[PDB]
Symmetry: D2
């Protein structure tokens, strides 16, 4: 053979991936996560899983054909979860998505039923994995993945408000003529209608915008900064109305979280975690709060000092999510 | 105003972008080019153009929402070509796309008609840009763009065989257990069925594979390496059959060419250029040959020493393209 | 020639760089700036300038030999400023550096005299550049370069407190077990002994550390956070005492600023600019305040809301700089 | 405590890094390797070791101060090898370095003696690491590290001719007006005076320069291409004469090898390995040949088809190295 004429093999050794990532679901979101992760050089192996065989193989081959321009030497796919073996991170993007005028909370029964199959199959082959939930309603589905997997809470993360906060900062950036990287602001709670803009923490270079305009974020605000939070809430629906779905922003948001996990960065992100014991919440509610994210998932939670109005809005978001959690049939 | 309370403006300057890129066409190819360029930090401004207003706005908004995770501070879109002003590079991905079980040659007249509208509009707003043609059949459309624009040939580039060669190197790499970056081989001529694998230049670490297998790539090859080029030819048809279209690998190939142009790298790429005068070709035929690509587009061509077999196949590829091209009225 | 047998030239080589950067001074700082800029792919051309012939050629050759691993196709050097023609950014690192126990303020006479030769020569060849002053005392030298250059104040930037703030954020991060990217804190005023830690703006996820611990940064603080600012002030002295000079951190801080300039990011950095008109300062003092930094240099200044002690400390830093600056002759 | 008022801790992590790199030696080479690895985001932990206490601490602090600008969350140092525990890759740059006009072979006993202390201490703390030898004479010291470590040969790698080949490609690129990435050429054997330029494999786009010029690299060559190899051999001596040492190019060359190892790329590099069984070599000689480099180090060797003259020159390089190698006291 030409291979043996050209190359002398010196080592037999069984190859075990060291920084493997799995993406479950090859819809627009799953593929946006995959291309973003590949272009950020976060993985030494990428596995794709779906139930539609042709689409799955087609997507895998299309990524494989770009290998010369990448630094991820193995891209694989299968409907069989054995392909995901030894993942450090498993990203779940499978399930139904909301129609215009439909709440993400309406996807709950359909997506729980799918998670009942996916979750046990994913965890089986990857003892060192963190579970990163993207599927909606993300907060509820992070709780569901946590309950089905039996994993400790640090290992089950929802993409949550990482995207809502990126959108908030983009919009704040546009109003101020500043890059979103230098515009600070947190959108917490449900990744959905009940999200909470933390006006008290909105700042540029440590300068609180609320301290310059005490009415910031209220109906009495002359500049109507509340409209920025409304644009954040409505963003998925606006994009869905225009292009049919959303993909790029969520893909970049998920790759941002994959980077903190894979590189053990210990950066702070507003992502879905269990909040029992904070802000008077006595139940096993998952929602976004600022979390320290690294190689073991969420190791620490930042205790945000909220005003009584912000805390009441966060509790209202938690009560909404808890109500849906009470509807779950395991 | 809150902005004026927070920030002292010292310079009111709109200012022209210095490294602007425009992508014409927001289909799967155009958006894969867009995301790949964004993730490679090649531009300070990205402009998107299309005729479907809602689709265009939603795509632009979806990219804008990931701004926090990027280093391209301005993303704009319009059906109006005024949005493309001062582009250094304009990438054309618009038109009818290759269909299941159909040649790229079947899209020719429809895409020539679309180019009669696009090209003068691009030229009006960026008369000094480099045009990068991606739309199929790419070799013919690069010639078409060249004739319509009135630009010198160096500034009209076709993505051509940059992807066919990347596919070839991926497949060669899989066979040898070597990264495609270390597997060298060139696929020239038409970006399509009549492409030419240059078996005489196929090598690893300067070791000619043909020196180890004299029959390499011929019918008489005991290992049938011609099947690797057959896989290269068939790739888009297989991917289209499986997922409906191709996008990821072409987006990466296009970003690879955008990088050499924007960064004046002078790397060698197999891309579409006028081959009149080489290998006995006497007509204004465009096809892929290895070109030096930089800030002024194609400045030089590498003269590959083709074997009589390879030269015959390249002449045949040129004949197939000219045949279609001569019966073109514009 | 072999070149003409291999390559057919199709275009006359009138090469003019599009993103050229010049580094003046090839001491440890200049070279750390050069390597960091090369590794961030910020330039299509890198020019080096110094007065020591051998050292300059050796440094240029050593960078050139790494070209295969870089995306900066042209690296040049000369004592002659003609080599710096058409730069978009010129970084000044030339001049005397402080000994152990010597203030940066003591370098002023030597460095002003050097700037009288360097500054007109830089502007003569790069009329479109932004000037990035690194040489010490940076704040006074930014004012000096501005007066000599004839450039508008937005185009004359001092690296200032971009490094002091990065040191502050690293130390804060270490104490909290959070990445410095998520630890916000500003050190303003002189890049030297009179720098001001803005305790009121110190936060993680918008949570003010001063609101949690009112004693923060005072002598009554049980955790002695004032020692963090003391370590910031003493950093250069401590590192000089240990390794003889500093290079890596300043190199990275300068590359960070070069990135915001070259990519027009409009990120906020604490850098040297004219502060006359703010905090009751009436003289042409330059010092660090948070600035919006982009393609036209400093376009805007953020008005930080300082506590009475922080403001008095900032005014005192301005007085210190003015006491040295008022006695200058150039 | 402030940390506790701000953050709720969820778990006590293992804190064992997953992509740890150690650099032994904080001289100019060691630090250039350190900065290049840090800027390529290859590690989650970087450890530095040296015998000069002050210089070690100063260097570690200077890197730490740039953390905000990096993605390597932990940078540590100590004279004690306990700091190197669980490294995937250990890079040895320690020992005597060449003075002006000094042969690398002259450093042999001083470096073998130093390696007698270093190697057992590295093996004790990371028994599963890959060893990457940079210290000179690199080929002999890779043999020394292999014998002392007791490691299998795949895990003991010398930087060898990776830099010599990069210099060759830079020089070839400058002559042709092509980026070194598109210029292919291999320098094998000793990383020193007896290195071998493989003229038969020198090409651009698979076009052999020797096929165009049959006298390429000989005394009869009109363009004197042999001078390119002479420039390669003389490079380190020329740079040492000018700046006192070399650092940048070797640092980039080392980070390139580190990248193939850490990311399991399986790229081909000309690096030091055991060549027993090839080209008539019957002894445990280490020298540069093209190697497939990945997560398990050197898994395979490419068999280069050398001409009788090229093979005699390689056997000459082998004989020269073995002469010293066979009589080592350790
Ligand atoms: C039992 C099941 N396992 C899977 C695995 C993947 C998918 N794939 C998607 O749902 C992709 C399309 N959806 C979005 N939102 O992109 C569905 C199922 S059903
Ligand atoms: C006169 C015309 N101007 C344009 C501009 C853009 C597009 N857009 C596409 O064709 C995108 C979808 N097609 C592929 N190939 O992705 C069509 C036209 S028609
Ligand atoms: C009229 C003059 N033009 C120059 C240009 C460069 C340098 N070079 C340095 O000073 C580098 C070493 N200094 C530090 N601080 O790194 C000195 C002079 S004097
Ligand atoms: C027993 C010993 N262990 C070590 C460890 C590190 C170093 N450090 C250097 O040699 C750095 C300076 N030299 C070059 N080549 O950069 C020397 C020794 S001696
Ligand atoms: C699994 O499907 C999705 C998950 C999240 C998003 C992100 C989206 C949303 O939450 O609806 C958004 O906010 O843009 C979109 C998805 O399908 C298109
Ligand atoms: C031009 O010389 C320098 C400019 C800035 C620094 C940065 C340094 C300082 O300001 O002394 C620091 O803070 O590390 C160091 C220099 O030479 C060693």
């Amino acid at each position: 053979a030409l291979k043996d004429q050209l190359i002398v093999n010196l080592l037999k050794e069984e190859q075990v991936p060291q920084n493997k990532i799995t993406v479950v679901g090859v819809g627009a979101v799953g593929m946006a996560c995959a291309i973003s992760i590949l272009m950020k050089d976060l993985a030494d192996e990428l596995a794709l899983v779906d139930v539609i065989e042709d689409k799955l193989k087609g997507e895998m081959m299309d990524l494989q054909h770009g290998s010369l321009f990448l630094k991820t030497p193995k891209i694989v796919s299968s409907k069989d979860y054995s392909v995901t073996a030894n993942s450090k991170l498993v990203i779940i993007t499978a399930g139904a998505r909301q129609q215009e005028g439909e709440s993400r909370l309406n996807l709950v029964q359909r997506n729980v039923n799918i998670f009942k199959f996916i979750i046990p199959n994913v965890v089986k082959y990857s003892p060192q994995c963190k579970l990163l939930i993207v599927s909606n309603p993300v907060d509820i589905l992070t709780y569901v993945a946590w309950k089905i997997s039996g994993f400790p809470k640090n290992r089950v993360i929802g993409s949550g408000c990482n995207l809502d906060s990126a959108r908030f900062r983009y919009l704040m950036g546009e109003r101020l003529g500043v890059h979103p990287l230098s515009c600070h602001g947190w959108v917490l709670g449900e990744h959905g209608d009940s999200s909470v803009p933390v006006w008290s923490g909105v700042n540029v270079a440590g300068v609180s915008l609320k301290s310059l305009n005490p009415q910031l974020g209220t109906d009495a605000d002359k500049e109507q900064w509340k409209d920025v939070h409304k644009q954040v809430v409505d963003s998925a629906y606006e994009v869905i109305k225009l292009k049919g779905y959303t993909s790029w922003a969520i893909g970049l948001s998920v790759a941002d979280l994959a980077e903190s996990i894979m590189k053990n960065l210990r950066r702070v992100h507003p992502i879905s975690t269990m909040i029992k014991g904070l802000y008077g919440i006595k139940e096993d509610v998952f929602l976004s709060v600022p979390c320290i994210l690294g190689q073991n998932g969420i190791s620490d939670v930042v205790k945000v000092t909220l005003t009584p109005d912000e805390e009441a809005r966060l509790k209202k978001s938690a009560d909404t999510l808890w109500g849906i959690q009470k509807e779950l049939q395991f």
